[PDB]
Every structure is written in C-alpha cells, then in structure tokens.
Amino acid sequence: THDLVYHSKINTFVWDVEFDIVLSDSKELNKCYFVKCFNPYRINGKCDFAVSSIDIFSEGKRLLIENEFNFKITKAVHVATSKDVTEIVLHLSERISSPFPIVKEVVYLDWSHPQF
Amino acid sequence: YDYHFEVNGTVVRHKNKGFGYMERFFELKESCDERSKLSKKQYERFNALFNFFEKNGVICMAKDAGTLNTSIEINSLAYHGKYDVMKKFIEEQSVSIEDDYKKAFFLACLGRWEESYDLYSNIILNSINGCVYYLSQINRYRIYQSITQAVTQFNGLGRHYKPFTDEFLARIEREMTNFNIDDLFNGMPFEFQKKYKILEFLSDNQFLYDDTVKLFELTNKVSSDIVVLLRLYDNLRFLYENCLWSVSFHEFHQYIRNSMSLLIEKAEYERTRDIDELGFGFFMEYYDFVNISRHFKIDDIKNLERSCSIDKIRFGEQEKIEEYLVGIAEEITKQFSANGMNVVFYTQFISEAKAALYFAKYVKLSEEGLGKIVKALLFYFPERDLDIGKRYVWLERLTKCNELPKSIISIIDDFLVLQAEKHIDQNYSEVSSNGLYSRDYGALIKHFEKNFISKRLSEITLCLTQDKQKQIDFLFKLLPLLSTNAKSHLLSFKSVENINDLMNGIRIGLIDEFTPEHEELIIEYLETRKVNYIDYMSTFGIWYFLEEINNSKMEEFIGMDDQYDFFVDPENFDYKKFIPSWLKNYNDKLLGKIAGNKHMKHHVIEVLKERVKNSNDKRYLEILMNYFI
Amino acid sequence: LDNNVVECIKEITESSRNGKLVFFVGAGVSTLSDYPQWWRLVDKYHEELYGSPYSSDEYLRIPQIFYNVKGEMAFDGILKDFFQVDKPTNPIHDKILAMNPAHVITTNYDNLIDTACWKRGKYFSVISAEEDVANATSSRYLLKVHGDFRKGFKGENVVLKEDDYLNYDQNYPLISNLMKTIIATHTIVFIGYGLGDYNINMLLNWVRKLQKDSFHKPFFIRTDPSPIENETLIYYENKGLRIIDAASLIDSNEYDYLERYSAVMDLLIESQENKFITKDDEVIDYIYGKISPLFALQYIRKIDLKHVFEYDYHFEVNGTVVRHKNKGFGYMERFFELKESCDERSKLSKKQYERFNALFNFFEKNGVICMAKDAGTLNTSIEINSLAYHGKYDVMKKFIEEQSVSIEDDYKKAFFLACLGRWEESYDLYSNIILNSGCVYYLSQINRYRIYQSITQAVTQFNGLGLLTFGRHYKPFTDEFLARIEREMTNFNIDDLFNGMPFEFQKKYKILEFLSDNQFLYDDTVKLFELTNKVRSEMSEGSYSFGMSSDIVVLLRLYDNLRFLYENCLWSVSFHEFHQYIRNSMSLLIEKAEYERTRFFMEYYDFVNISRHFKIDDIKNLERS
Ligand SMILES: NC(=O)c1ccc[n+]([C@@H]2O[C@H](COP(=O)([O-])OP(=O)(O)OC[C@H]3O[C@@H](n4cnc5c(N)ncnc54)[C@H](O)[C@@H]3O)[C@@H](O)[C@H]2O)c1
C-alpha cells in the first residue's frame, strides 16, 4: 500500500491492483482494473451528468458495459507484490462512498483542456 | 579576467592593472580618426577584431552602455529543425574540414549516428590550430555515448529494433576502449591549450553547474530574469552554432527546462504581486517556443500550465512559430506518411513534435498552416505516441486560439470516416489513454458546427447491415453527424425493451428525449427496486432534477436512496444525510443547475463552507467559487 | 595466472591509470605487421658484398662493411628500396595505444606506431631527430630513439650501422637523455624485444650504474615461442627486469607470434577495470584504499561517495547503496555482508580486520547503512556537531583564545574567526596554516580565497554603501591589510588550485575538487528543482500520497550539505547560493507540510536554518501561503 495515492479532486484512489469480481448475472471477469478520467470540461449531452468517466479493462483489454454493472469485489491482487489487498479494498470502498473507490490510474483532462 | 563582459554586450574593467586595452579599443572603434593612425597590418587586425566583437555581440564598456538591443539570433540549421536542408547539406560534397564538422553535427541531429561517428573519425584523421580536431574528438566521444545509451534503451525497450549493427557496435567499442575524455585537452599541443583554454569545459562531464546554480536568483522574493534568459541564449548559440553534440544531452535539456520554468514562474509571481499591490510579464517569442518544444517533455509543459497562467503569456513572432509548427508537421508526414522512419532520429524528434503541437494551443495558426498541422496530427502521428484520445486532446487544444474552420472540420470528418471504415474488422478497436474516442471528435465537430451533417458517415450507416455490428455501434456515438435518413436507419438496430437497453442508448446517445414509455420503464424499475428493498437510482434522481423526466410520479420512491431524495425534493431532503463528495461527481452543468435551483443552495453552501474550513480542499473551494453552490 | 604475473599486471594497469606508463616498443611489434626484419637487410648486404648469405655483432658489422665499401649512396639505396613499403598497423599497436601510455619509446624506423597514433586519434609529438626534442609541440613524446625516415629514406637519419651505435651517445645526446629521463620517471614495458637484444642489454648496463633502489624495474613482455629457462629468468630479473612470459601465459605454436603478443596485450587491457579482488581480504583492502583518505574530513556527503567509487554504486541520502556501474565484483555488497555476519569478520586477517573496523566506523558515522534490497525502517537523526552552526559565539571565542594543539585546531579556529566576523585574523590564521602544512592545506587555500572574497565584498559595500547605511565611513580593514591581501590573492586562481596538487591527492580527494566552485551545489540544486516541480504538481492535482514523503529526499540532502559544510569548517556555509538553496529546500518542506496538515514539525534545526538562511520577506511569504 506504499504506492496507494488518494486523488481528492475525484475522491478516489490510484492503486496498482487488479480485481476479480462477480456481477449481478454470475459472470466472472479476471484480472480486471478500472481507469478513471476526470473530465469536467467534456462536451456533455442532455443526459450526461457525471464529471469523470470510468473504463474497465480485463486481461489488458477494455470492456463494453452494455448491462447494469452492479458488481462485488471477490479478490484484489497487487502487481508489485502479489499480496491480496482485498480487505483493504472493501474498507476503502466503504469509507469512500463513491463509485469505484480504487482505480488503476486517474487521467486528469482539465489541465490539457483549452478552456483550462 | 582582465575584463568582465556583460550578457547584454558591454565590458567592465576588473582585475586589470596595466593599460586599458579594451577601453582603448572601444575608443578607437568609435572614432575612425584615431583608427587612421594604426599601421596597415594593425589596421587589418583591428578590422578583424571589430568583426569578431560585433559578431559576438560585444558593444562597448559599461559607461558607454545605452539603448542595447539584445536580440537572440542562433544561426544554425539544427536549431530551427531544417531537416531537409540538413540532408541536402550532408548530400553535397564538403569543400573543407569545417563543412565536414558541420556535416557530422547534422548527421548526429538526424539520427544517423553511425555516419556521424565515421565522419568524426575521418575529421580527426585529416585534422592533425587543432581546434576542429579537439572539437571532433569531443563530439565523437559524445556520439559514442549517445550510441551506447540508445543501444541500452532499445535493448530495454515497442518493437525490437537494431539501428546499429553489432559489427559496428563492436568496432566502436574497440576504438573507444579505455578512451579518456579528461586527458583530451592536456594531451594537446601547449599552444592549443594556451589559445583555446575556453574549450576546456567541453571535455567535462558537467558544464552547466554555474548556470544552473545561478537560477536561484529567479526564486527570490524581495534584472535577474534578463540575465538568466541571455545566459541561456548564449549557451544555446554557442552549443548550436559551433556544432557541439552535447547540446542534445540530458544535462542541457534539463538546464533549459529549469531556466525556462523558473523564468515563467518568476514572471507569474511578479504578476500576482503587482496585482496584489497596484490592484490591476514574460513575453514569449519564436526562440522561446522552439526551446520549450524541443527541451520540454509533455509533463514539464503540463507543470508549467498548472503552476502559472500561461494564457497570460503573450506569444510573439507567431508567424515564425507557425512556420516551425508547419515544418514539424511536414517532418512527421515524411517520417510516417512515407517509409523513411529513422528509429534513432524518430526517438528524439517525436518528443519535440509532441511538445510543439501541445504548446501550439497558445499560438494563432493560419488557416492553411492550421490545416497542415491538423492533418499531420490526426493522420500521420504514430499511434505508439499519440493514441486516439491523446490525438483528440491535441486537436481540441488547437481550437482555443483558432475557431474550428470549415477546412479543419472537413479534415476531422475525413478522420472520422477513416476511423469508421477501420471498423469493418471485428477485432480492430480504438485504444485511448485519455478515455476519449472518435465520438469525442464528432462531439467537437457538432460543438463548432451544430448543424453540420457528415455525408460519408451517413452513407456508411446507409450501407450497414445486421452483420457488422461493430460499425453499427460505432456510428451510434456519431449519431448527430448523421443525416435524418441515416439516423432512422441506425435507430432500428437497437431495442429499448428493458431498462438496461435504455441506459445503453442514453450513454451512447441513441435517445436524447425521454418518451413517456421511457418514463414508464424507469418507473417500473423504481417499483421493482422498492419492492426488493426489503446504481441508476441517482441517475434517475438527477434526470428528474435535470428536467429530463416530467413523469411527476417518481416521488413514490423517496426514502431509501439519499441522492434520489436529495434530487427529487431538495426542500424536503434531510441534509444531515447529504454527502459532500456528491459535488465532486457532478459536472459543470449539474453543479450550476444545483446552485441555481434557488432551493437547497444554502445547504450546499454551508456544506461547502464546512469542507473548505475543515480540509482546505481546492476542489471544494473551486466548486464553491465557480458556481457558488 | 602466476602471482608475480598478476602483480605485474596490477602495476602496469595502475601506471596506465595514473598516466605514468611508457611503452618501449621494439622491432618485434613492427615485424608483427610483416615489416621487414633487420636480418633481411643484413642478409641482402651480405649477398651484395659476398657471393650469398647473423650474429649480434654481424648485425652492425655487415651494414658497416657495406657502407665503407659500396658507398653511402649504395647503402642508402638498399635501405630505401627495402623500407619504402607501406604496411598496415597491427591490432597490437592499437592495444598499446589503448593502454594509454604517457610516452612510446621505440627503436623502429617505421611509421607504423605513427600511423596507429594518427588513426586512433592520439596526438604524440614525434621525436626522431635531435632538433625534434626542443620543438616538441606537446608534452607526450613518441620517441624514435634510433631515428626514422620522415626526413628521408637516408642512412644518416637512422641508427643501423655499427658506427651509428658506437657514436650514439655523441650523435643523439638530447634523444638519449630524454629516453633515460622517461625511463627513470615512468613505468616502462618492453614489447617486441628479445631478452638478448642489443638495446635491452645496453639499457640494463646503464641501469646497473644507478642507485640500488632509485628506479623502478621495467616490465619486459617476452613473446618468444618457448618458455624462458629458469636460469635466464633468474639472471635477467636480477638485472632489473620484471619479465611477463607469453609462452608461460598460454599454449601456442612455434611461429604464431601475433597470438603470443595478443595474449599479453588483451590480458593487460581487460585487467584495466578489473579490481583484482576475489577474497574478502582483497575487497576490504580496496575499500580501505578508497575510504582512508576521507578519514581526514569530519563528514562526507553521501551523494559525494559515488565519485569516490567511480560511479560503481549509488549512495542514496537515506543510507542505502545500489549497484550502478560495477560490472566487476560487488565489493560493497560483500562489505555489508561482512558487516552483518560477525562470524565472518574473524575470518579476515589482523590488519584486514582493523581496516574493516575503521571502515565500519566511517560508514556508520556517515549514515551509509546497506544496499537497497536489505533496507528496512531507515530513520536517522540529523545532528550537526558544530559550534558555528549552533551560534556558540562565546564558546567559539573561548576556543579561539586557546592554544592550537594541532593544525586541525588551527583550521577550526580560522573557521570560527570567519564566523565571528574577524576576517583579518581568520585570513592570517589560514595563511599560517598554509605555511605550516594535504587535505587541510587544500581546504585552507579554498577557505582563504573565500575569506578574501568576503573581505573584498565587505570593503566594497562599506565604501560604496557602508557610509550611507551606517551614516559613517567604517574601516574594519586597514588599507595596509587590504593591499597585502590584494597582492597575495591577485596571483591566486581557485579554478587551477586542485590541479596544482600531487596527482595522488587528486586521486584520493577528488570529491573535494567541487569545493572550488558552486559545482558542489549542482547535483542537489538540480534535484531540488525537480522535486519542487513534482511536489507542486501533486499539490496542484490534490493527490495525497501514502507512505514515504516525496520531500524527505530534499530534507536529507539539505542536512547532508549542512553537515558537510559546517562540520568540515568550510566558509561556503556563508555563500549566497548556499543560502538560497537552503531557503528553497526549507520553503518546499514547509509548503508540503502545510498541504499535508490540511489533508512534519518544525524542530530546533529547522528553526535555526530558517533564521539563518531566510530573509524577513521569505518568512513573510511563507506565513502568507
Ligand atoms: N640471422 C637471423 O637472425 C635470421 C635470419 C632469417 C630468419 N631468422 C629467423 O626468423 C625469425 C626472425 O626473428 P629474429 O630471430 O630476428 O627474432 P629475435 O629473437 O631477433 O627477436 C626477438 C623478438 O622479436 C619478436 N619476433 C621474433 N620473430 C618474430 C616474427 N616472425 N614476427 C613477429 N615478431 C617476432 C619476438 O617477439 C621477440 O621478442 C626468427 O625466428 C629467426 O630465427 C633469423
């Protein structure tokens, strides 16, 4: 947990951990992580409200979320050390009260925007 | 040390005890009557000295100092990235050994390090004043170091490349075995070591420690800025005009980074202090732009942007900067549009091209030059450096100072059509690091052309069938760019029978207005969730808040999801259940609507005040300051 | 190989590194490039003189007889037609050059060594005649003791006939004296010579007349097909030669001479960077050789240690060593393994054990702990043992009053005087230390130049703005003292101070060189800037790292610099640039501390640093932000 960072702009965490999770349809995804992109200046449509967009990458390739992604974390594995960081992951998820408390990497698109 | 020469072109006597030869020389230069006395040989020698001093920008003594025009002018093809001219120069036959030294430097600058090393060896053979010999030895050692580092990097790192043949690598390793750069100067003829002592520093591993340590004067808070800038210009001119390869090493790049960054930060600090005192600085030019592009990584540019208000930095010589950018675009096209990609040259040049196109946001670009830059960035920029999202970020940054013209819109439409055509394969997918994809380019096009309709994308949708689903769902995110008939053709390919289909359509943009059946779908989902009580809930709460639903029956689902109740009935919500982190998720539109609700605005104001007072969070503070929620 | 051969290799490589290696290249190396051996010329002369076709004396006699009989023109023509042939340069010429010899003496008339030097990018002033000695354009000589054909392929330009050898000392006095001086003052390696060679034995006869232990035994690279007989080796090694036998070096044929030469040349070259340490005793001996000179200094900056070991290991400011460029044996890892395992320590010798104990004390007091892999909870207290730092003005005055029991006490007294404003007394004490005194002598030269600079700046301010600021014309320094200091220091160049030192000092105290200029502040300064950026970047984006602080490196480097400058009593502690560096480091630390607090505590050292190195405006800016 020495590489864990708390990004407060979007109250999430950056941690190099993959996740094994079971969705609401019993589907199994392995070695999946999340990438958050904080885009407040993003060109927003009528029904778009969220400030940051999250992508899911399983086995090095992203996934298209065509269904409700209600999921529960079954296992969390750290890359630098194979130690299971699950319980800490659940603790942080409970504390944060935000979607996807832990993210593989956060991409800040505010400073690279022309309007910044 | 008999005299000290200012970086602004003036001399001051110090440590000189005998005759004031510098003052006498300046007096002689000022008046030709006193010059007429000198003998013929002395007259020619004075003329040569005057040429040298004017060329090197030494004007007069401190007392004579007046309107000093200190304009930088680096006469080097390598500095301006005139790669075609450098190649032409290398192709042509070299008349002398000085042209061979220039050729070797240009070959080093073009990534042709083997040819440059061989040319340096030839110059060393044929050059034994000995100044070119010493400089060639220095540059050959530098190029050997560069080759070694490049070999190490390529061994460590996307595809396996072997720019230097193992035979050549072994030959250079044997030739440079036990080679000492420290002893190079001491081994030179004593006449050389006397005449050319000033070149000693070129044999040292570090030569910018003095210049770097003099940068602390930019961090003071109590001209230093002009001194630092002129010192940097002096170093650049000396290293480039003299064709020294150490101008490409990490030490010099870091020195330029530090100097430019500290100069900009000092200018920003002066600006803020002046605003605080008077209650309402760094003027960048072509050379500053080139230095920032070449010696700055994208991370360094981002640090500059976040630290300072670079939008307040006026950019000068913008036509020259646009010429630089267009030349970079042409070089990118040559490197990639053709098959002339040099691995060694590309490694170094891609960073400068990326930084130049990133920094171009601050420069007004002519329509034709803007089109050239845009096409080069969109099409011929390698994907291993700019992925789809990064390329979109680069492109959108260019609209800050140049409203998207029709030609640039056509270029973006061409890119979109090519992206769609690439989707015929069921395995090709857009890879983005910023999370931005082709739909983002379409959104930008509609932003600057609201009623713009893409004819070729419309046709591509009008040719789609039930088979190539990839093209189908790709064109769904490009729905606004499609025509009415194309929109109708695409819409038939998705079903909204269940709520999840509605969510997917809304996310992809299939449906933008909630039809009554959509509201009833949301309602049945709410009923099922309520029944099963003993993720989208906040989404529907926001939609009702955002006036995206006029059902007026959602209130039946109040009392289980804090965000939903908070959004449906802000007045009746108990704000002890409010989580301030919610405000960190809403975008500008939702936060502004919350602030303007005229209800619950005081609750959010007090929560934000508590957050700012207890955590000093800049995000909460900026939320409160911008929308005053 | 044999122990004596390895000792010869070590001595040769040490000389090559020190720039005191001279190569005496004979005719064998030239013949290695197929150059015509002299016996061919002698046989041609014999065939011309008599019907048809040599002893050592015949070598000189037959050319002499042919000269006297057939004319200088005939002798010269034979030489020209036989020698006016271009030949390639051997890989052994390039090996000799790659050994980095200070000088290359040679008895060859060819330009093969000249061509190799020209190709390898080595500038040697070629001395082949008497006039060339005074006209030498460089300080490194390519000395052709027997002449050459650069002037022309004439028999009077080279030493071939017997008369030439008889009158050599009279015809080549300058060249002979130069050769003897180079032999006396350098390490000589003979290659391409037979042990029974005329020139080698003449040189041995000359060496016979020298003092018993006034010269270094030349190294003789013997590359004859068969191993040297023990009797011959005994005879020639007692004559002042240390023989490296190639036949004993490797197995070879009878007529493959290039392989025999290359064996020795490569074995020498590849040993250039070889520490030649395998057992723990040798590793500890090498480490002590590297670290013992530093025992003079009170404290050594960890970032400086990388220069002590020629970038073999990174010495991080947290006390962890890391392999950087030590392709050879890992001696720091071995040393730390010895340190951890007490049982191994006894396995070392008595002297080796004492040296290891001294090294352990040095490393422990300098905060060097272990390698990165073995690093644990590395926490260190920052204590500076200096009276000047803690502002013990009364204590420094009392110490100054006391009597100097050593030159080190004089150094500390001079530093304290500089720190008490008594610059004239401090300068006089520094001059006295220079006279009495060489680490302290060099540091005293540097400190005296710094104090002279401070005196000059103070006088400038007092005379230019001192009257306006104080409302009075203050004269802290008498005009006599100012004139004397100007006279003394006007001829002093700080830049060349380090070079004007015994080469052993420049090898053992390289790290002190940086004290000449602000280069000693370079690395840290650069790091600071980088770290600043990084830290600011984080605070710009609101990220809150967990664990090791990104600014702890800045604090560690800051205290490293403070300890090195104050405990070593260097006037650089008063420099404007050093004050700016300290101020920037502390400002970054305080800003990061505040940022973390909102989501480091100020101590005595932090308070003293802020007070001493911060202006009031800087403190006000810190309070504002
Ligand atoms: N009268 C003669 O001396 C004569 C005449 C013709 C041939 N030869 C034979 O041919 C060879 C000529 O050499 P030398 O007798 O003058 O040696 P030498 O013993 O006179 O010279 C000794 C040194 O020269 C080197 N050397 C000897 N032969 C070499 C070769 N062929 N190539 C490169 N280096 C060599 C060795 O390394 C040795 O250190 C010898 O083997 C000799 O027996 C001798």
Residue numbers in the entry:
A (entry chain E): 11 to 126
B (entry chain B): 336 to 463, 467 to 495, 501 to 565, 579 to 636, 644 to 897, 911 to 1005
C (entry chain A): 22 to 74, 79 to 462, 468 to 629, 645 to 670
What did the publication describing this PDB structure actually write?
DSR2 contains an N-terminal Sir2 domain that serves as an NADase effector responsible for NAD+ hydrolysis, a C-terminal domain (CTD) that functions as a sensor for detecting invading phages (as discussed later), and a middle domain (MID) that connects the Sir2 effector and the CTD sensor. Monomeric, rather than oligomeric, tail tube proteins preferentially bind to CTDclosed and activate Sir2 for NAD+ hydrolysis.
To further investigate the molecular mechanism of tube-mediated DSR2 activation and DSAD1-mediated DSR2 inhibition, we initially considered whether the binding of DSAD1 might prevents the binding of NAD+ to DSR2, leading to an inhibition of its NADase activity. We observed a strong density corresponding to the NAD+ molecule, occupying the same position as NAD+ in the DSR2H171A–tube complex. In contrast to the weak density observed for the nicotinamide and nicotinamide-ribose groups of NAD+ bound to the DSR2H171A–tube complex, the corresponding density observed in the DSR2–DSAD1–NAD+ complex is much stronger, indicative of stable NAD+ binding. The NAD+ present in the DSR2–DSAD1–NAD+ complex adopts an inactive conformation, as the conserved catalytic residue H171 is unable to access the nicotinamide-ribose group for catalysis. Superimposing the structures of the DSR2–DSAD1 and NAD+-bound DSR2–DSAD1 complexes revealed minimal conformational changes in DSR2 upon NAD+ binding. Affinity chromatography analysis further confirmed an excess of DSAD1, ruling out the possibility that the DSR2:DSAD1 binding ratio of 4:2 was due to the inability of DSAD1 to saturate DSR2, as observed with the tube proteins.
